[PDB]
């Protein structure tokens, strides 16, 4: 009655029989931009059902030695479906998201994934090891697209900050003995009313195993983690030709 759940938006429906409730980041639901907060004058386009639906973009395999991964929003979707097209044809974009991370196993497996959302997740580099070289992460690392990217040093989140404090951000845990999924709703977060979906990633989705996956020889060893997400209250403005970056 808090374990069972159904999420329906657009022409897509998700079900789960082992949930752990739903998190609504910073305590507020996504909303369209008000006439007082707005600044751009053109009438926006709000595609509704064709873009605010569930997209299942990627699957990773959880292994006894996995370090963890991250994805950037809206980067992950910029090249998928009608959402992607709208994000490419328009300069300005804004939306919220419903993120549903899936991972099931058996009552004999164990492990815990921390699923969190970190706004303005700026990536850093190891600075040449000694810290004397002022290196910078390449485009493929800051905006990894749908395949996401694996954390090199999860302890400091590849950005010099403790993962132990990541719980100060909207999050849920996927503790196999308890639940098989995480659901996080996120409102638009920025210091501007709209922004480029291409040049700016509003937040990052982190999936990091804090308690290692484990099981005995003979139990299914392939434990996938799948990422499904749905834009919410999408708005676009500043129309012109399509641009990929």
């Amino acid at each position: 009655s808090d374990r069972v759940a159904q999420l329906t938006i657009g022409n897509s429906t998700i079900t789960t029989q082992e949930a752990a409730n739903i998190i609504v980041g910073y305590g507020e639901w996504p909303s369209y931009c008000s006439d007082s907060d707005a600044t751009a004058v053109d009438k926006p386009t709000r595609p509704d059902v064709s873009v605010n639906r569930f997209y299942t973009l990627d699957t990773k395999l959880w292994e006894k030695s996995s370090k963890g991964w991250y994805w950037k929003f809206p980067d992950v979707l910029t090249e998928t479906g009608v959402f992607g097209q709208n994000a490419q044809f328009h300069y300005l974009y804004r939306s919220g998201f419903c993120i549903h991370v899936q991972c099931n196993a058996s009552k004999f497996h164990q492990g815990a994934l921390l699923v969190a959302v970190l706004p303005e997740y700026v990536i850093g580099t190891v600075a040449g090891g000694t810290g004397t070289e002022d290196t910078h992460p390449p485009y493929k690392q800051t905006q990894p697209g749908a395949d996401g990217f694996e954390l090199q040093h999860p302890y400091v989140l590849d950005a010099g900050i403790p993962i132990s404090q990541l719980t100060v951000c909207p999050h849920q845990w996927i503790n196999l003995r308890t639940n098989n999924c995480a659901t996080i709703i996120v409102p638009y977060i920025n210091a501007l009313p709209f922004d480029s979906a291409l040049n700016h990633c509003n937040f990052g989705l982190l999936v990091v195993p804090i308690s290692p996956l484990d099981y005995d020889q003979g139990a299914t060893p392939v434990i996938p983690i799948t990422i499904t997400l749905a834009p919410m209250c999408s708005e676009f403005a500043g129309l012109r030709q399509a641009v990929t970056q």
Binding site: D2, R3, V168, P170, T178
Partner: protein, 58 residues
């Protein structure tokens, strides 16, 4: 006073009590802020709230 409203906190849910001698409000002192707090925004951002007495997973 009859000054400009150019303070970084103009229109905040927490009102301030400050001092100033110039026509621009941002020159004013920091003053006293209002003591409101909303811990739940971060500590309990759940949709369907769960009681203390009951077991969290019903």
């Amino acid at each position: 006073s009859h000054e400009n409203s150019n303070s970084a906190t103009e229109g905040s849910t927490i009102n301030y009590t400050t001092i100033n001698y110039y026509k621009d409000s941002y020159a004013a002192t920091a003053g006293k802020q209002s003591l409101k707090q909303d811990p739940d925004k971060f500590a309990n951002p759940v949709k369907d709230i769960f009681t203390e007495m009951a077991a969290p997973l019903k």
